[model samples]
Target: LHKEPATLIKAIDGDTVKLMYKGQPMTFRLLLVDTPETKHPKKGVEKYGPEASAFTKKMLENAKKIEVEFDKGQRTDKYGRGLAYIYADGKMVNEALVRQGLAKVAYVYKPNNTHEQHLRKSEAQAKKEKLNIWS
Candidate 1:
């Protein structure tokens, strides 16, 4: 039901990561948060996009352990993967991303009530600060 704490192995961009949890390799998405797309060469860059990714990487680099929380929603998108909230030292990394204005609140088809409120607040703050692709 619960996974052992993990370490961030690498950040695949802004919202994705490779983690080492319970001696197994796992990839996780920072649930309820979507950062600007930097990997797509054709897409226009988002404001603070690079800064967001870099901030996430640096934060995770110092993360000794990570916690994963799953929801009953889609579990994953069209891609066969697990959807989870990554926590470090009891802090939600997804929320942190939004608070830092590196990511936006994005809920696809899933019903994510637990993190929805905080994510919305984060977005409002980001918008107030003009931190986004448009900024």
Candidate 2:
């Protein structure tokens, strides 16, 4: 898959990001991972949700290069925002968050879940180690 260059405009949460792609700003919901919500109307702030959000902000802010890759299937969710794999300085941000136990693989949406196994491996290790959210 070809990666398109992007720059972080905002880190909405651990799994939601806004970026400047080409000349336009786009919002993307990271595919295959769901992090704790920093702000959920019914649930309030979830455990470690603030930490997860901060981690994403830190990573994106410090990245020298950022990019996004769309899956072969659906590129957008019902909200009309993008669904993609975000990269920061060559690392897959989605996988990194999962490995840290700040996010878990969710929204499997088959055919669009090309990186499912890759993220699952990281999640497995996080669960085994009981990191962050896993604890």
Candidate 3:
């Protein structure tokens, strides 16, 4: 519903991350965005995965601080990671990822998606630009 403070620990791959939440280490799946996995065992790092990870890490680092925002519906995915919108310096980092082509507008629909339209617009912009993952 609202935003909560958090700190970036590191990028788990592309779409996933480890962070400090409530003084303890926790994981969060960036809501409405999905990037190629760098550590996907069978795939063993998909193309653009490294770039996506780098992008995410840099984004997390760019802020003076970080915050996690939640939706009214589901808070965590099936895997037990908190689902949230990341913020830094007033910018929505999750949307930025999609806009930059480092990730796609992922499994976001209905109640799970407060930022659905906005995220999809950003994704379209990335695809139109033919950037990184899109290219």
Candidate 4:
């Protein structure tokens, strides 16, 4: 995978964000972590969805800077959102989300191999801790 720096433009939701990469606007979906659904054209909000969204926005807001690391795996979902890992303040945002129990490990597309094992461990710990969504 190629790692590149991007400025966080917006948190489209808990798992997707808009970025300014090389001066071009792009949307990227965070790899390995899936938060609750905040929006669905037909279904609307789900429980804990807003909390996840707020957590995502709060974490990004606190970052002095952010970057998107494109996965070597399939570069987009079937819906065509760019696939990448997010980082801020030297922490992997995807892992952070799961570790904090705000998200669960998700593999809509796999062999995201870079941090899959790590994310799963973090998720397990969060579940054991009974934090937030895990509770």
Candidate 4 collision pairs: none
* lDDT tens readout by residue for model 3, 76-105: 878899988888777888888888899888
For residues 1-135, write the lDDT of model 4, one tens digit per residue: 656788878888989888888898888888878898988867788777888888888888889978778776787778878888888877888998899898989865556668888899999999999988899
Single out the weakest 10-residue window by summed lDDT for candidate 1: 107-116
Query: What alpha-carbon RMSD in Å does predicted model 3 have with respect to the real structure?
Result: 1.3
For model 2, residues 1-135, the per-residue Cα lDDT tens digits are 779999889999888989998789888899999999877799889987888899899999999999899999989899978999999999999999999999989969788988999999999999999999888
TM-scores, one per candidate: 0.82, 0.96, 0.93, 0.91
Number of clashing residue pairs, candidate 3: 0
Q: lDDT at 4 for candidate 4?
A: 75
Candidate 3 Cα lDDT to native: 0.85
lDDT of model 1 at residue 77?
58
lDDT of each: 0.74, 0.91, 0.85, 0.84
Instruction: Please name the candidate that would achieve the greatest TM-score relative to the true structure.
Output: 2
Off by over 4 Å in 1: 1-4, 132-135
Q: TM-score rank, highest first? A: 2, 3, 4, 1
Root-mean-square deviation of every model:
2.5, 0.9, 1.3, 1.6
Candidate 3 TM-score, true structure as reference? 0.93
Per-residue lDDT of model 1, residues 16-125, tens digit only: 88887668777777777888877777876766778778877877777766777776576665665557787877777788888777887886454744678878888788
Model number with the top lDDT: 2
